[PDB]
Design a protein around this ligand. Structure first.
Ligand SMILES: [Mg+2]
Ligand SMILES: [Mg+2]
Ligand SMILES: [Mg+2]
Ligand SMILES: [Mg+2]
Ligand SMILES: [Mg+2]
Ligand SMILES: [Mg+2]
Ligand SMILES: [Mg+2]
Ligand SMILES: [Mg+2]
Ligand SMILES: [Mg+2]
Ligand SMILES: [Mg+2]
Ligand SMILES: [Mg+2]
Ligand SMILES: [Mg+2]
Ligand SMILES: [Mg+2]
Ligand SMILES: [Mg+2]
Ligand SMILES: [Mg+2]
Ligand SMILES: [Mg+2]
Ligand SMILES: [Mg+2]
Ligand SMILES: [Mg+2]
Ligand SMILES: [Mg+2]
Ligand SMILES: [Mg+2]
Ligand SMILES: [Mg+2]
Ligand SMILES: [Mg+2]
Ligand SMILES: [Mg+2]
Ligand SMILES: [Mg+2]
Ligand SMILES: [Mg+2]
Ligand SMILES: [Mg+2]
Ligand SMILES: [Mg+2]
Ligand SMILES: [Mg+2]
Ligand SMILES: [Mg+2]
Ligand SMILES: [Mg+2]
Ligand SMILES: [Mg+2]
Ligand SMILES: [Mg+2]
Ligand SMILES: [Mg+2]
Ligand SMILES: [Mg+2]
Ligand SMILES: [Mg+2]
Ligand SMILES: [Mg+2]
Ligand SMILES: [Mg+2]
Ligand SMILES: [Mg+2]
Ligand SMILES: [Mg+2]
Ligand SMILES: [Mg+2]
Ligand SMILES: [Mg+2]
Ligand SMILES: [Mg+2]
Ligand SMILES: [Mg+2]
Ligand SMILES: [Mg+2]
Ligand SMILES: [Mg+2]
Ligand SMILES: [Mg+2]
Ligand SMILES: [Mg+2]
Ligand SMILES: [Mg+2]
Ligand SMILES: [Mg+2]
Ligand SMILES: [Mg+2]
Ligand SMILES: [Mg+2]
Lengths: 64, 111
RNA sequence: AAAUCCAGGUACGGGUGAAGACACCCGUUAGGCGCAACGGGACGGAAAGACCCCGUGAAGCUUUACUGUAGCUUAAUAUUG
RNA sequence: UUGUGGUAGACGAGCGUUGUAUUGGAGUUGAAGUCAAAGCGUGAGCAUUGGUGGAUCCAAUACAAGUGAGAAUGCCGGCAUGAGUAACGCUUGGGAGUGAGAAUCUCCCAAACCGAUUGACUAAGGUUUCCUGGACCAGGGUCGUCCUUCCAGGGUUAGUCUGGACCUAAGCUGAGGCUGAAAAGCGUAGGCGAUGGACAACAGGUUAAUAUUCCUGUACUUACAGUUAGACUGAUGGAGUG
RNA sequence: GGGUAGGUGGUAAGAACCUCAGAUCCGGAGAUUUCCGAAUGGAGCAAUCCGGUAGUUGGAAACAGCUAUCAUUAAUUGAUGAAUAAAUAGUCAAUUAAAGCAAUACGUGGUGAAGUGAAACAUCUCAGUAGCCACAGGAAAAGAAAACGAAUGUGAUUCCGUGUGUAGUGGCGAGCGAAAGCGGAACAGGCCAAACUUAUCAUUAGAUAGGGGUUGUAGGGCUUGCAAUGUGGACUUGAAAACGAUAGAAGAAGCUGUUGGAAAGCAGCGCGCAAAAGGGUGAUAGCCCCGUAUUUGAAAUUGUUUUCAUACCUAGCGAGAUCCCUGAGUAGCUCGGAAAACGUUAUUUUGAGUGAAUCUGCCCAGACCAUUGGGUAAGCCUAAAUACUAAUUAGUGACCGAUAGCGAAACAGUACCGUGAGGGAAAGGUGAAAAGAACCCAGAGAUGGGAGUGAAAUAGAUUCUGAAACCAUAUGCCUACAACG
């Protein structure tokens, strides 16, 4: 599914309000992007994470 | 235990037959009835049926048998007492044999 | 068996009447009851008119009617040196 | 004294049903129900007697309601009218017999239609409708002693037939895996999937009902073991054929 | 274990047996438990087909009996091991869990309409309802203030009444509608991270296993002393006792006469009661029977509570130092949404982007700033009051009494309808007792008329009572020149 693999954070369902306040259901999807995380110099899996989790990994010196 | 057993003398205290003394030949606990010999004589109109070795003859005319009687209408008959009377019974347990025995309440007669 | 059937013992002419009468008014005619026929009438039977109108009814379709939207396209921003 | 027609409508006073609470009373010497009659009331309504019936019911004062049926092309059940009317959905005569009863059942002789079919073998489906004896509640558009109806008993025999233990087509399922808010969708290896491919039995007879299945006669095929003789054996893979 | 003298389940008579060495029956605990079904050796059109492996018994083997085992996923461990040296991916084996169902009911979360109302309709309402899906539990959820809120104030959460249809929010229209405070039900607060320290990992640890700590009238760590050996838990094992649950035992008191088929009704004379609740017995029984009030009893399983011991957790007030720690892609901010009564806004939440500080710190008191005051976010667990009843036991009803009550009083989700999902009926009463009509007559027989049983046969299996419409028979009256709501 369109969800993170490190965390479980997924899509966010809400309303699409326009002029005249017409209601139409819409879905916000997470910015899923591919990244490779080294683990003890091995198993460089090409995991699919969000950009928020990618920033967390970057500031943690690629720790997960 | 039971008020009426198979064998003891019994009489009827209500109905057309009053003071009818007899011996209980068989007791049905489920239907609360009791077959007593000589009382409640009914005469089924015996037909003729021939489909078996015994049914080839099955000689049955005006056979009078026994009709069952409600156990409530029955009352135990006293024998040990010189002047016999109809009464109710207890369920005392004598420690001599530790077995329950019926004893009348208007006298001291066992069973 | 069947649809039908408010209860019926259910004539014709002129008139009248919710405006075209077996039943009302005035006249005429007609013994009681069947059977075989043919359809004049009973505004005959079957279908809460499909035509018309009404309802701030429904549905299908159309468009430069309104409000939106899938899709398509453009830019900013993140992945992105 | 003035009044008393009346729809929509407003107001007031009452009847009746079921049950509950308090009092009293009746009832196998006959309660409710139910039918009939020549009664009483201003109205809803209320009694008396007799028949039937077989165990509950009544009066008063209050209280609570699933409390009042003529209509809704109202629902359910029964019964009329139409009406003994339309209809009874392609096939004749006679002789003998059974039987309480025969145009309709059994047998026989004809007769009339089918005869690229109303004839015979089977697939699919039907699921005992098949055979024997008995019956005539119901069903049979009439009748019935008779039936594909009902009752009781019985009937379907495979190494070779039709399908599995063999194989695949369309397609289905599908560990991992991919995709997707969830349920799930797609899909690889494998596995299913005939309407196709490969595979050894023919002739006759027999019972009321089964027969390449049972019986007779003559055969064939595939496995395993022992044995004799010969030969080096050669697949989960390659190739040819299929 | 209880309990007896009968039993072999109902339509059900008969045949044949069992049973007083204690049967049938009731209660507790066990044994066996075919096939399908989560179905799980493989398949498949459910209750079928086809197997593998390791044993063991017959055979000369094929083979055939009799046993046990063989699905998938996840976690742990061990072995083996590619591209490619090492190492992973992968493969195999062992152990432990998960699958599914239902209680037409409650809980949480995700997703989420429309009929309708606004007398049209699009904002809005309906409604975060129906439905779909995931996860449970015996309840769930929530929960210990970065809080309410305006005060010499209260001090987790949950539920009930009021505050009130109030403040407010709404094409300011239809409508929607709290949070404080007050009165009640119940009441409980605990524990990690970081400092600091110990031991070990080629100690590059930035990792593992321990001691120390859990905060707001700030807490803890660093150094230095006094007082402590207790009280209490949401807590483990045992032992003992009490109160129960699942069979039971005992359990008082009436005769006579009358109508009647039958007395229990009626009448006379009595009696018992911690029992006058109820059911049956030929009518309407306190004293006929079973029971009820009351007193009692458990071998075995199981529930609650209490006592004792036993683990685990659990402990105060000072001094100095001025040093360290207090939860970061976090709180804020911007762009689109939402939650709260609010139609987006101080507070809460998040899809995209950006991004802080460290007790002289940070957040809050409806934009915002300053003063004052309140509180300590970015970590976790939490009994009670609360929601519901498919089921077990007892009981109740100014609830129903075969068109009513559950669709279903009977063998009802049946017969039947449909390819399927699905839809879905009608039907109860003989008599006290079958004593269910032997026998005669007519008839082929069913059946009818007598006889017989019975109080009643016009109670006869067509079986309580039997209404009307409807169809026939008959006493009496009228009707064939007669226009008829
Ligand atoms: Mg809307
Ligand atoms: Mg008719
Ligand atoms: Mg005129
Ligand atoms: Mg019309
Ligand atoms: Mg319109
Ligand atoms: Mg509309
Ligand atoms: Mg673009
Ligand atoms: Mg008047
Ligand atoms: Mg009354
Ligand atoms: Mg009467
Ligand atoms: Mg009514
Ligand atoms: Mg009719
Ligand atoms: Mg007729
Ligand atoms: Mg006619
Ligand atoms: Mg005719
Ligand atoms: Mg004709
Ligand atoms: Mg014909
Ligand atoms: Mg003919
Ligand atoms: Mg011809
Ligand atoms: Mg043919
Ligand atoms: Mg049949
Ligand atoms: Mg035949
Ligand atoms: Mg025959
Ligand atoms: Mg006939
Ligand atoms: Mg053969
Ligand atoms: Mg196959
Ligand atoms: Mg084939
Ligand atoms: Mg044949
Ligand atoms: Mg025993
Ligand atoms: Mg709407
Ligand atoms: Mg509207
Ligand atoms: Mg409207
Ligand atoms: Mg909880
Ligand atoms: Mg007893
Ligand atoms: Mg007693
Ligand atoms: Mg009584
Ligand atoms: Mg803020
Ligand atoms: Mg809202
Ligand atoms: Mg402060
Ligand atoms: Mg302020
Ligand atoms: Mg903090
Ligand atoms: Mg019913
Ligand atoms: Mg009925
Ligand atoms: Mg069917
Ligand atoms: Mg008779
Ligand atoms: Mg009748
Ligand atoms: Mg009757
Ligand atoms: Mg005359
Ligand atoms: Mg004349
Ligand atoms: Mg005239
Ligand atoms: Mg006249």
């Amino acid at each position: 599914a369109k969800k993170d693999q490190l965390t479980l954070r997924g899509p966010l369902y809400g309303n699409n309000r326009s002029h005249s306040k017409t209601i139409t259901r819409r879905k916000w999807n997470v910015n899923l992007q591919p990244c490779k995380v080294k683990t003890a110099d091995g198993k460089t899996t090409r995991i699919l994470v969000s950009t928020r989790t990618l920033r967390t990994l970057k500031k943690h010196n690629r720790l997960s | 235990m039971q008020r009426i057993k198979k064998g003891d003398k019994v009489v009827v205290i209500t109905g057309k037959n009053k003071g009818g003394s007899g011996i209980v030949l068989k007791i049905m606990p489920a239907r609360q009835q009791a077959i007593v010999e000589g009382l409640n004589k009914v005469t089924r109109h015996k037909k003729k049926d021939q489909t078996t070795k015994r049914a080839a003859k099955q000689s049955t005319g005006k056979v009078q048998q026994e009709a069952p009687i409600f156990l409530s209408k029955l009352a135990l008959f006293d024998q040990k007492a010189k002047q016999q009377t109809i009464g109710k019974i207890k369920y005392v347990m004598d420690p001599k044999t530790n077995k329950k025995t019926r004893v009348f309440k208007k006298s001291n007669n066992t069973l």
